[PDB]
Design a protein around this ligand. Sequence first.
Ligand SMILES: O=c1nc[nH]c2c1ncn2[C@H]1C[C@H](O)[C@@H](COP(=O)(O)OP(=O)(O)OP(=O)(O)O)O1
Ligand SMILES: [Zn+2]
Lengths: 180, 277, 277, 277, 277, 277, 277
Amino acid sequence: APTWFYNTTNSEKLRELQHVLGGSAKLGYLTAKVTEILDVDLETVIRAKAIAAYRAVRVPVIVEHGALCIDALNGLPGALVKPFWESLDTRLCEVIPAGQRTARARGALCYCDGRERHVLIEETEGEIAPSARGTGGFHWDPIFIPKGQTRTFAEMSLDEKLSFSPLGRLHTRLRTELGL
Amino acid sequence: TTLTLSEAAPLLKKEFREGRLIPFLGAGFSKPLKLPDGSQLIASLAKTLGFEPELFDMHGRFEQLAEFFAISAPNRLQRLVYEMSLSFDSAEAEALREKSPMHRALAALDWRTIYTTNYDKHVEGALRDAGKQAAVLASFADFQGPRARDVCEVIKFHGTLDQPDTIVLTESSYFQRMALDAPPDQRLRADLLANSFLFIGYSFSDTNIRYIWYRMNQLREQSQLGVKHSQARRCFFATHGAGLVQPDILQQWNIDVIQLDPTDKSASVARLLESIA
Amino acid sequence: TTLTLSEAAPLLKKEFREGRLIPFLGAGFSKPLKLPDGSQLIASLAKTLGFEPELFDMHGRFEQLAEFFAISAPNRLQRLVYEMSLSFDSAEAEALREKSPMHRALAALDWRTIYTTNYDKHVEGALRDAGKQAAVLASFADFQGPRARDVCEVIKFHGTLDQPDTIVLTESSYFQRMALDAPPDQRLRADLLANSFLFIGYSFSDTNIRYIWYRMNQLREQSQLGVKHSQARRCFFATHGAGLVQPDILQQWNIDVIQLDPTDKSASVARLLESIA
Amino acid sequence: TTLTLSEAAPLLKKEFREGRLIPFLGAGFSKPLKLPDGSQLIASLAKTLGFEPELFDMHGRFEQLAEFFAISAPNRLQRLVYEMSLSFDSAEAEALREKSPMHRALAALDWRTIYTTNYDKHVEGALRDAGKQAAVLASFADFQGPRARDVCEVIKFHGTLDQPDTIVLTESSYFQRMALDAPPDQRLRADLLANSFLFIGYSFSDTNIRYIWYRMNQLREQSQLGVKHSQARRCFFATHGAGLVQPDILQQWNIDVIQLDPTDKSASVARLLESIA
Amino acid sequence: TTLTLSEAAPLLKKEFREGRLIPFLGAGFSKPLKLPDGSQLIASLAKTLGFEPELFDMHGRFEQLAEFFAISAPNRLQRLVYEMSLSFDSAEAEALREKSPMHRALAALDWRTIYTTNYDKHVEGALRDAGKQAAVLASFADFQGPRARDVCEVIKFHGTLDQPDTIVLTESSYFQRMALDAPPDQRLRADLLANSFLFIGYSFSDTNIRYIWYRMNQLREQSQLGVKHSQARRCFFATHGAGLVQPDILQQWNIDVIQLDPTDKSASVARLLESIA
Amino acid sequence: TTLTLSEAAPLLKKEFREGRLIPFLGAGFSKPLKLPDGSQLIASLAKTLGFEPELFDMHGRFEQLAEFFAISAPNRLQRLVYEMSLSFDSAEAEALREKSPMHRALAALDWRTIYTTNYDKHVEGALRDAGKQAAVLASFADFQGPRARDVCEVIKFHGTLDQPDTIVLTESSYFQRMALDAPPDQRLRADLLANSFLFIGYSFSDTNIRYIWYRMNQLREQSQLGVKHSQARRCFFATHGAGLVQPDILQQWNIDVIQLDPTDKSASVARLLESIA
Amino acid sequence: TTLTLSEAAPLLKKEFREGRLIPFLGAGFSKPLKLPDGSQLIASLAKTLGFEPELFDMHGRFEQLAEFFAISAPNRLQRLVYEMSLSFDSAEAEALREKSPMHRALAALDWRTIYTTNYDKHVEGALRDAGKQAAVLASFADFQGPRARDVCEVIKFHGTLDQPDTIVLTESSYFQRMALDAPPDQRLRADLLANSFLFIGYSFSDTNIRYIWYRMNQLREQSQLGVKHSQARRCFFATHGAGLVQPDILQQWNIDVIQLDPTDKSASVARLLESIA
Ligand SMILES: O=c1nc[nH]c2c1ncn2[C@H]1C[C@H](O)[C@@H](COP(=O)(O)OP(=O)(O)OP(=O)(O)O)O1
Ligand SMILES: [Zn+2]
C-alpha cells in the first residue's frame, strides 16, 4: 500500500509524474478538486493548496502548482496562469510586445504529511514564442521556448520536455526527500 | 504505530474463533449503498429550513444543527424519519446490497452480536440475504421479546427507523444517552467487559461512544493490573483516513488502528472481512 | 427574539436587588488583558509539538488536541501550567487589569458568588483592586477551609493555576467532570436551582456546561409546571456574535440572549455591568 | 470517645459565629408535640390493613411496610397524607409548640438554613412564633420561586404535607432518591461541602442520608489531604441513646457524637441550643 | 591557607582543558537577578503565616520553617511554587540576565555538565542567550528522555519550577534525599568519582551535599592511597566570605577555597570564569 | 494542642503498666548536676582554641565546631574525653545525684530499657543509688557480653566516657551514624516498632534522631493504615520551652508535647515521673 | 515475544547514533579465546582441593564454592589470581584475539563506555588491536586518575587481574557489593538512568546485577509514568539459549531478548555487532 498520494485533477500532469515516479510502489494517486487562493506568488498559492487538499483526502498528500511569470507583464500571470490560458488561448502570444518576450516557467511541489508543509520549487528561464507551434503536451506548451533551445515544450517528446521543464528536476528532489 | 491488513489478520482470527470478536458498524459501512453520511443529512436539513448548506454548517456541530431542525416547527422530526425511511430503506438500496462485497463478506461469518449506529435495515438485511436470520434489538420491548435460540443479535445502538422513538439524532437525545441507562447502553458496557470490538466504517465523533471507552479504563486503571496484563485485550479500528491526533488518543483506551488502502474503500474492507474467515 | 441592552437592564436590576443574580465569566472576559483564548493556546501547543498551527487544528476538537499534547511526553502538562502561570498572571496583565473598564464595573457591584471558567487571578484580582476581598474556591480543601463571614466567593469552575490538579483542559478531564461529582459541579447545580445567571464573555462550547442546563430542564419538565410558571426564572447570555442556531437551542433551557454592540466589545460589556447598578 | 455538652459547646459557638453551622432536625424533634415517630405510624398503618401492630412489624423494614400500605388499594397513600395533615399540624400541636423549650431555643438563634426530615410545619412554625420569617423549600418550584433577601430557608428534605408529591415514605420513593438528583438532594450535597451540621433528634436510619455522607468521604479521601487536615471539618450528632456500633461507623464520616442526658430528653436538647448563643 | 584568584587560575585551566571540571551553582549566583536567597524566602513565608520575620526565624532552621509552612493548610506548598515561578522566572529577571557579566562568562565556556541547586531557568537560560543549547535534567523522565548528541546537561539538583514534585524545600524532602537514591543524587555521586567541581555562589549549608562529600572520603580512605595520591584530585570553593571554621572542615574532603574580592561580588566571579578560558 | 501534666498522666500509666514505655533522656536531665549542656562545651572548646566564646559560636553549628576542634591538633579529641570524664563524673556530681529529685523519681520506677544521649554515669548511677542494678550497653562488645536475667538495660545512644571510641560529638561521627548501622541505632529502630517513648530533657536538634522518626513514618504511611489506627501509638515529649514550629513538625511523627511548668524545671520533671507510678 | 536479529538491528542503530547504547560483556564473550567460563573454574578449584569436579558442584552455588576455596588455606585466593593471569591473559589468548570476528566487530564501532564482568584484558585489548585507545577503570584510583579527552572507558565491573583487590569472586565479595557503594556500582547506576544497554555473552546469574535492574524499576514505578512512556527506554539481551522463564522475568525490567542463531555462536554475535554500524 502507498504512503504518499499525489493529488491532481489534471490527467495530463498525471501521465507526466507517472512517467518518472511511476515505478515507485510507495506513491498513490488521488483526484480531489481544490480551490486556489487569489495571489500571484507561487509560494503562497502552493502552500495554501496543500492545506486545502489534506483537508479533503486526510492522507499524506503531494500537490502541484505552477507559474508563468512574464517580464512584459511585470510577472503576470504568476500563479494566475490557469485562467489566462482559458481566456487568452493563443492571443497570449499577441498581447506581449515583440522584442521583450522573456519569461520564467516556475513550478512547485508541496507535500503535507498532516503536520508540516514543505515546498520544492524549480524554475526554467525562457521566452514566449511569436506564435503557437507544436502538438504534444498540454496547456501553454505550444507558446514557451526554453533558453538555448529553439523548440517549444509542445514540439518535444515527454523525455525531452522533462529535460527542460521544472518537473524534471523536481522528480529527484521529491524522490530523495520522501524515499520513494 | 499502526497495524496493516496482513498484520491484523491473525489477531482477528484468534478472537473470532474464540467467539470474542464483535463488529461495530458506522455510517461509512452504508456508503456504497448511495446513502447520506452525517454531512449529506445536514445538507438536506438546510434545504428544508431555507439555509444554504455551507452557511448552515458553520453555526454548530452535527448534534446541534439537528436539534435546531427538530424545534423549528411541530412534527418536524417525525417527517425526517419518514423521509429517511423512504430513502435509506428503498428498493434500489436493497438491490445494491446483495451485490455489495462488504455486506456479503460480513454475512459469510457466523457472528453472534453486531452493533450498528446507522438507521437502516442493511446490516440485518445482509444476514437475511445469506440465508441466515437476525434479531434486531433496539428498544426495551425488543430485549424482552421472544427470539430464537442461536441467532445473531443486531443491536441498533442509535435506533431504528421502524421505531422512531429510539432514534438519537438531536443534541437532547445525545444528552439523554449520557446517563448510560438505555438498553443499548447497558448491553454495550457488558459486552465491552469481555470482548474485542472491530470498528468498521465508523469514526469516533460521538461523545457518548467515547465516554463509554473512557469509563472502561477507569475500571481498568483502578484494578491495578500490570503493564503486561492491562494491555492484553485490544479493540480494533479499521479506517482509511485516520489523522495524526486520533490514533494516539485511542491507544489510551486499548484501541488499535488498522490502516486500510484508501484508493478503493469498499474492496479494502471486504478483504479485511474475508481474512477473518 | 433577542433582548437589547436597554430591554435587559430592568430585568437584571430586579434579580440583582433580590440577590439572585450570579455572573458566569468566560475566556472572552480576559481578552482585553491580551491573554490567549481557546484558539491561541492551540497555536502554542502546535509550536511545541512541531505542527503548523493550521494543520494541527484540523485533527480534532479543542479537548482532543490538548489530550494529545498531554500524552506526548512525560510532565508535558505540568510545563503548560507553569508557562500559562507566567503569561496569564504576569505583572503586565495586572497593570492592564486596573485600567480595564469591565473589571472595574464588575467589582463595583456587591456580588456574593462569581463563577469563572478561566485559569487566571483577574476576577478575584479585580475585587482586590476595588478594596473588596474575595475567596477563591476551586478544590475540596477550599470549600472546607476557613473564610470570612460575608465575602464574595469566586468559584473557579475549571480550576486555578496555583492548584494544577484542578485544571480541566484535556479530554479525559472533561469526561471526569461528566459525572457532575466535583465540588464545583455540586455547587453549580445547587445555585442553578435558585438563581439567575449572567453569562459574560462565555460561549457554550463546553459539553459539561450544556449538560448541566440540560438536566435542570429534566427537573423542570418532570415537575409539570404550567406554560407561565416554567418560563419565569430566566438566565441571560450576553454575546456580541451569537449565530442563528445557538440562541434557539438555549431558549429550551430558559436562557435569553442579550445582543451587545460588536463594534467595541469592551465598552458594550462595561455598559451592561453599569446598568445593573 | 464521645463529647459531652460542655465540651461540645465551644466547638458549636465557633462554627455558628462564622455562619457555617446548619441544624438537621429529625422525627425526635417533634416528639414533645405528641406526634408519632416512625414506629407509631406503622402501628396506625397496621390498624387500617387489619394487622396486629406487632405482627405487621416483623414482615419488613419501615420503608417496605409503607410500600405495602400504598399499594393495598388505590388512593391509599393520598388518604394517609390527609390523615397525617389533620394530626401532625393540628391546633393542639400548635399550642404545644409555643411553650416548647426546644422550639423556642431553636428560633432564638439567627440561622440561615435548616434541614428537616419530618412532615410538619413546626420548624418553620417555630420561627414564625419568634417573630422571624422562614421560607419553606421542598420542590423545584419552591427553589425558583420568589423569597425575601435574608430569610432562613427551611429545607424540607423529605417533603411537606401541603405538597403531597414531595413526601418520601415508601420504599420506591427512597429508591428514587438514591440518584441524588432531587432539589433537596442537590442542595444538601453543596451545603455539606462547606458547612458543619448539627443532627438533633435524628437517628441515621435512612440509607439515602448515610449514602450522602459516604460519598463526601470519597471526595475527601481522593483529595489526599493529610491526617490533620482531613479531620478538621466535623459534624455533630446529638443523641441521648446511641449504641455501641453506630458512633464508630460515623467517625469515618467526620461525625462526632454529643451525649445528652437521657433522663429528660427535652431539657437536654434545649440546653444545647442555648449554649450555642 | 587559601588560594587567590591568580593562584587558582592555572589549576582551573588544566582541569577544564581535560574536560574534568564541572560547575556547581548556588543561590548566590542568582543574586544579581534580584531574586530572594534562603533568607528572603523565609521573610515571605512569615508574612503569609502572620509572623514577624525576625520572630519566625528563631523557631528553627531553614528546612524546618518551610516544613512548618507546607503543613499549615492544604495546598500551601503548591501556591509557593506558583508564586516562586512568577517571581523567579519573570520577564524582568530575564532582562537582567542577558546583561549580567557572570551569566555571560559562564555561557562563554564549553561545559558538558552543570549542577545547580536553585529553582530558576537562569543557568540553562544563560546558555540559550549565548546561542548554545542546554538540556535540563531534574526527574527520572528527563534522564530517560531524548536529548541531542553533544549538549550541556544542566542537572537541577534540587528541582525545577516546571516540575513541582521535584522541588526539595521542606525538611521531609531533605530527609527523603538522605538515601541518595534520587536520579540527581546518583548522577552526582558518579560524577564526583572522576571530576573536579567548582562551587560558585554556594555555601555548604545543605546536610545532603555535605553527606555526599563525606562518603566520597570513606571511599578515599578505605582505598589506602598515599599522602601524595589521595590529595591529588581537588575541588574548588569560590567564596567571598567564608569564615574561620568552614575552610578547615572542607580540607578533609579535598575542597580548596578560592578567596574572591568581597567589594564587588559580581565582578569577582566574572573574572574567575574568564580566567578559565 | 499540647498536653498538660494531668492530662498526660493517665496516658503514661497505661503504657507503663503494659511495659511499653521507654524513657529517652537528654542533656537537660543532667543540668541539676551542674554539668555543661551543648552550649557550655563550645564555650570550653573556644577557650582552648583561643577564640572568644561568642565569636566561635557564629562560625558553624554544634557538630561543626567540635569537628573543627578535633582536627586542630593531634590527640585533641582524646584530651576532651579525659577532661569531660573528670568533670562530668566527678565526686561532687555524684553527691548532687543522690539528692536530686528527678534521679530518685526515675529510679523508683521499674523500667526495662532506658536510652540516653549524654556522656555520664548518672542515669545508671541513679539506678545503683536505689539499690537496683543496671547494664550499660554502648558498643558491640556490650551487646554480646554477659548480663543478668531481668536488669534494666541503659542504652548509651551517643557513647560513654569509659569507651572513648563510642562517643559521637564531631560532625564526621554524626555522618557515620546516618547509615543507622551502629548497635545503638539498630536497637533503637526495633524498640521504636513496638514501644512508646518519653523524651525528658531532650530537644530534637540531632539530625540522626529526627531521621529515625522520619523513617518510621515511611513504614507507617506505606502500610496504609486508617486515620484512626495510624494515630494510635504515640510518643511523648516533655519540654518546658518548646517553640511554635517544633510541636507541629513532631505531630507528623506521632509525638505529643507535654508542657511542663517552666518556673522550676527540676520539680516539674519530678512530678511527671511520680505520676507514672 | 522475542526479537530476531533483523528486527533488533534498526533499534540498535537508533540508540547508537544518538550515543546512548552501552555494551555489557560477559564470560561468554571470551569463550572463543578458549578461556574457562564459570563452570571450568570450579572444575579447576575442585582439583586443587581434592574433590571430584562433579561432587564439588553439588555442595553449593558458584559464589559459595569459591568462598570455600578462598578459606581453605592462607593465601589461597592470591594464588588463584596469579594462575588466572597466566591462563587468561596468555600470549596464545592474545593471538586468538586479533583473528576473532567478535572482537574485531566490537572495536570497529566508536563506543564511549564498555562494561565487562570478566577478568581479562581482551575487551580493552581488542580496542588496542584496532588502533584505538582505551581506559580501564576498575578501582577508586582509576576513576580519579588522569585519562585522555575522548577515549572509550572500559569499566571492569567485577575487577581486573592486575589489581587483585578488585576481583569479586567469592560469596563475601558479592555481599560486599550489595550495598551498591563501589565505584563500578555507582557508575553503572548513573549510566542506567540515561542509556540503553546491550548484553552480549552474559547470562543474568549475578544477584547484584539483577538487584540493580530491580531498583531502577522502583524509580520507574514511583515516578508514575504512563503505560506508553515507562516502556520507551529498553535494554537488549542477546542470547543463544535463554530458557522459558528468564525472558519473562526481564520484561519487567525493560529488557528485550534478541534470539541469536545457536548453531554458530561466534558468527551470530559478529553479525549483530556489524549490523549496528
Ligand atoms: O508543466 C506543465 N506543462 C504544461 N502545462 C502546465 C504545466 N503545469 C501546469 N500546467 C497548466 C495546467 C493548468 O491548465 C495550469 C495550472 O493550473 P492547475 O490548478 O495546477 O491545474 P488543475 O486544477 O486542472 O489540476 P490540479 O488539481 O492538479 O491543480 O497550467
Ligand atoms: Zn487547480
